[PDB]
Design a protein around this ligand. Structure first.
Ligand SMILES: [K+]
Ligand SMILES: [K+]
Ligand SMILES: [K+]
Length: 431
């Protein structure tokens, strides 16, 4: 009497559709019918209902194994594993090489028709359908990314986000104006500013434009009530001119021009939070960041009352908690990572029906178009039984082979409403 065995060609994944259902695969039964029991390697996987079972043994050559899945609402494949226990010995059955356990890889396919909702940074509106631009797949082929959340948000006269671009990247030698980089400075001096490594400053400038717009009425009062230092008076405005051609980027943003003319362009880079501090209040660390120190609202804010925060994330739970808190608190968003420290601005996020964050809409100062670009959000480990670390990779749809960008954290800028309120109540009490 030969011992019956089971076999399965492991290179064959079992791939159920995204729909809910009971799905099957076949296990070969050799020399009879082994007494075994299938088991998922994790029993707490929420999208699998119960254990797998042997649902038919009528064919002498094969067993049918069944398992039941919930609908995959997400835009990612998801993975489970089935092993088999010999019921007499209690031991896991060996695979073809005789050493590894026999393991069947289950990969339930993604939702091809997700319902997506969006959350944008407070005060910048939301894209109209006419402002959403589909994206060609690059290798530019004539294929397009076809998932609805993959769009560029085109800047127009009517859009309210900010995306200041690096003049060093836009510049075409011999075609752009020779004076493309010239800036008229605070003392009406002419300065040539370069921005090739100023990712951090472009991100700070975008956030500062948003902050000056949000706090426009407070800043008007501040200019009328504070004893402003004479040289700083021209800095209490923000001009961001939409509709300019690339050759005119030097005229587009007074804030970006201040960083370009008076900060540094060190190839190591800088930090978003340092640019934000430098613009808004005095701190000893930023003493030598530039050749001037704007510190425009030190009467309102100090480091103790700071509207700037820095937080890190290393899991899907950490990233999503941070993003949702920031978006629900009317804060602007800078994203950083070590690549030199890289920095971009985030203006919003796309969500699937499970509230997973699936895409970010990014002002990238290194990228050429006057648009926000979609950066897809992906994970390499399980998102149901999360490991100690599950980095939130970012996928640049615009690039022809997108290297993985592990988000390190978020530098955020709050409106500072309580601080502004306390400042204003203090002046009216003295009046
Ligand atoms: K689930
Ligand atoms: K099980
Ligand atoms: K998964």
């Amino acid at each position: 009497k030969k011992k019956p065995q089971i076999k399965y060609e492991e290179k064959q994944a079992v791939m159920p559709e995204s729909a809910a259902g009971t799905y099957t695969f076949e296990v070969q039964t050799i020399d009879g019918k082994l007494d075994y029991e299938p088991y998922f390697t994790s029993s707490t996987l929420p999208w699998i209902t119960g254990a797998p079972t042997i649902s038919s043994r009528t064919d002498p050559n094969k067993d049918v194994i069944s398992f039941t899945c919930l609908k995959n609402k997400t835009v990612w494949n998801r993975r489970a594993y089935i092993k088999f226990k010999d019921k007499k010995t209690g031991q896991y059955i060996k695979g073809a090489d005789g050493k590894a356990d026999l393991t069947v890889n289950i990969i339930q396919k993604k939702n091809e028709n997700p319902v997506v909702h969006y959350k944008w940074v407070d005060g910048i509106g939301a894209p109209t359908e006419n402002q959403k631009i589909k994206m060609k797949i690059k290798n530019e082929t004539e294929d397009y990314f076809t998932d609805p959340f993959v769009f560029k948000w085109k800047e127009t006269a009517d859009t309210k986000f900010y995306n200041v671009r690096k003049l060093d990247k836009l510049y075409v030698q011999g075609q752009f104006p020779s004076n493309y980089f010239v800036i008229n400075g605070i003392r009406n001096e002419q300065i040539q500013g370069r921005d090739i490594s100023q990712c951090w400053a472009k991100t700070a400038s975008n956030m500062l434009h948003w902050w000056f717009e949000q706090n426009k009425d407070y800043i008007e009062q501040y200019k009328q009530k504070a004893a402003i230092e004479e040289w700083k008076r021209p800095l209490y405005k923000h001009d961001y001119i939409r509709g300019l051609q690339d050759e005119d980027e030097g005229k587009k943003s007074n804030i970006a021009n201040i960083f370009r003319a008076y900060s540094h362009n060190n190839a190591r880079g800088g930090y978003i939070e340092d640019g934000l501090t430098w613009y808004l209040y005095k701190r000893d660390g930023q003493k030598n960041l530039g050749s001037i120190y704007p510190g425009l609202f030190n009467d309102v804010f100090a480091h103790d009352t700071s509207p700037i925060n820095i937080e890190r994330c290393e899991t899907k739970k950490e990233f999503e908690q941070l993003m949702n808190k920031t978006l629900d608190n009317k804060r602007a968003i800078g994203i950083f990572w070590q690549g030199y420290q890289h920095a971009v601005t985030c203006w919003g996020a796309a969500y699937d029906e499970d509230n997973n964050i699936i895409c970010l809409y990014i002002a990238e100062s290194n990228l050429p178009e006057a648009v926000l670009y979609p950066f897809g959000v992906r994970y390499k480990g399980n998102i149901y039984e999360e490991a100690e670390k599950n980095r939130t990779y970012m996928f640049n749809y615009a690039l022809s082979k997108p290297e993985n960008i592990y988000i390190d954290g978020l530098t955020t800028l709050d409106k500072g409403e309580d601080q502004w309120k306390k400042w204003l109540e203090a002046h009216q009490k003295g009046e």
